[PDB]
Paper text:
The Eph receptors are the largest receptor tyrosine kinase family, and together with their cell surface-anchored ephrin ligands represent an important cell-cell communication system that regulates a multitude of physiological and pathological processes. The intracellular portion of the Eph receptors includes a juxtamembrane segment, the tyrosine kinase domain, a linker, a sterile alpha motif (SAM) domain, and a short C-terminal tail containing a PDZ domain-binding motif. [name] promotes cancer malignancy through a poorly understood non-canonical form of signaling involving serine/threonine phosphorylation of the linker connecting its kinase and SAM domains. The kinase-SAM linker contains a cluster of five serine/threonine residues that besides S897 include S892, T898, S899 and S901.
To obtain insights into [name] signaling mechanisms, we solved the crystal structure of most of the unphosphorylated [name] intracellular region (residues D590-I976). The crystallographic asymmetric unit contains two [name] molecules (molecules A and B), even though the [name] intracellular region is monomeric in solution. In our structure, the αA′-helix is unwound and Y594 (the second of two conserved juxtamembrane tyrosine residues) occupies a pocket previously found to be occupied by the first conserved tyrosine (Y588 in [name], which is not part of our construct), indicating a dynamic conformation of the juxtamembrane segment even when its tyrosine residues are unphosphorylated. The relative orientation of the kinase and SAM domains is different in the two [name] molecules, suggesting that the [name] intracellular region can assume different conformations, likely enabled by flexibility in the kinase-SAM linker. In contrast, residues S899-P905 (including the S899 and S901 phosphorylation sites) are mostly undefined in both [name] molecules, likely due to high conformational flexibility. Thus, conformational differences in these residues appear to be the main reason for the different relative orientations of the kinase and SAM domains in the two [name] molecules. In both [name] molecules, the N-terminal part of the linker is partly wrapped around the bottom of the kinase domain C-lobe and locked in place by interactions of I893 with a hydrophobic pocket in the kinase domain. This linker conformation is different from that observed in [name] structures that do not contain the SAM domain, where most of the linker (including I893) faces away from the kinase domain, suggesting that the SAM domain affects linker conformation. The correlation of the two exchange processes and the complementary charges of the two surfaces suggest that the kinase and SAM domains interact with each other, shielding the interacting surfaces from the solvent.
Residue numbers in the entry: 587 to 759, 780 to 898, 905 to 976
The structure:
């Protein structure tokens, strides 16, 4: 579980260790329900034990004529999925790796992909019901982050919905969903997943509108890099749009963590009157212009790419900004910032931080 060693970089080993090899005689294939990258997807039934009643499943298959790399990549997804056990993460029943066709057998999600489901159900849920869907997705992502798993492809199309409307993250083992630092520098983290989650929030509250659909990919690239952002969906609580914008902070360290997101959404759901104030919706607006105070020492340090010293500050008792602004340049040396260039970068930043805490602006 969390904290335990994980196997995210060895597909065959994860298949061996974390999947149940299912005998083909236990699987009954029924109607086709989708087309995947590697082959058709079916609804079916699974006998897990000789003396047990069959249970409904989804059956993902690998197309005939596959290459061995396609086979490894296909089954590798199950090796990842089998390490997870959470209400909002797709549950793996097992795989067939010994006989053709290769199969991945999962719980059946009758309502399919969330973006398609919401378009089919346009306008038919309450805002509160939509926020509960987002809470379920966030809870799954909180679990993945705690499992030190970065998803990299979080989008409404990769959330599946079952008959009880439970939303579950899938797709283990797309510029409009990807954080700026992940596109430009390939820095994928749970914080870039949080960016994606903000996009998912926008997809859900718009009932499956395509993000930045008015724009080409090249225009999306300028938008995200320069700081343009999606405008509010129609009928979107201000608290929910403000959370989207927080997920889309340019500086990844300023984005909320998934544990924070779940707590925020829980508070809103428990007091649903908090959802009644809406963000101003103007149908003529397609994009917001760029937006023009550090909460933690870690945020401040990462803003200047000095996060490698975070624990050095904490251990010495410099755990808040109001403490940091009292630091001399010799204190920085004292706690272990040895490299002169790093001393200089922190010293200069502290000057600006001291300007900030001493700023006064009282309207009369
Ligand atoms: N457990 C499940 N229950 C019900 N339907 C499912 C399902 N798993 C997959 N599907 C259906 O099959 C479709 C495609 O499945 P899936 O997303 O796994 O293919 P894929 O993973 O190859 C796309 P990509 O290559 O972009 O990751 C889904 O849109 C979904 O409708
Ligand atoms: Mg997938």
């Amino acid at each position: 579980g969390p904290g335990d060693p994980h196997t995210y970089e060895d597909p065959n080993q994860a298949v061996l260790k974390f999947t149940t090899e299912i005998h083909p005689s236990c699987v009954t294939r029924q109607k086709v329900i989708g087309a995947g990258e590697f082959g058709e997807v079916y609804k079916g039934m699974l006998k897990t034990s000789s003396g047990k009643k069959e249970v409904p499943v989804a059956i993902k298959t690998l197309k005939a004529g596959y290459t061995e790399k396609q086979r490894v990549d296909f089954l590798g997804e199950a090796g990842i999925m089998g390490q997870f056990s959470h209400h909002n993460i797709i549950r793996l029943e097992g795989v067939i790796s010994k006989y053709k066709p290769m199969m991945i057998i999962t719980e059946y999600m009758e309502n399919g992909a969330l973006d398609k489901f919401l378009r089919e159900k346009d306008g038919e849920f309450s805002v509160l019901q939509l926020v509960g869907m987002l809470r379920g997705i966030a809870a799954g992502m909180k679990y993945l982050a705690n499992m030190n798993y970065v998803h990299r492809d979080l989008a409404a199309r990769n959330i599946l919905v079952n008959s009880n409307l439970v939303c579950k993250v899938s797709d283990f083992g797309p510029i409009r969903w990807t954080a700026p630092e992940a596109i430009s520098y390939r820095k994928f983290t749970s914080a870039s997943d949080v960016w994606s989650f903000g996009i998912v929030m926008w997809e859900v509250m718009t009932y499956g509108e395509r993000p930045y659909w008015e724009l080409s990919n090249h225009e999306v690239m300028k938008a995200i890099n320069d700081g343009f952002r999606l405008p509010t969906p129609m009928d979107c609580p201000s608290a929910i749009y403000q959370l989207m914008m927080q997920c889309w902070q340019q500086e990844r360290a300023r984005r909320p963590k998934f544990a924070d997101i779940v707590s925020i959404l829980d508070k809103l759901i428990r007091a649903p009157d908090s959802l009644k104030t809406l963000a101003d919706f103007d149908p003529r607006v397609s994009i917001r212009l760029p937006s023009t105070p550090f909460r933690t020492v870690s945020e401040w340090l990462e803003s200047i790419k000095m996060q490698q010293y975070t624990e050095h500050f904490m251990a010495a008792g410099y755990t808040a900004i109001e403490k940091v602004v009292q630091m001399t340049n010799d204190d920085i040396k004292r706690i272990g910032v040895r490299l002169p260039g790093h001393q200089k970068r922190i010293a200069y930043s502290l000057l600006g931080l001291k300007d900030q805490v001493n700023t006064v602006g009282i309207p009369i």
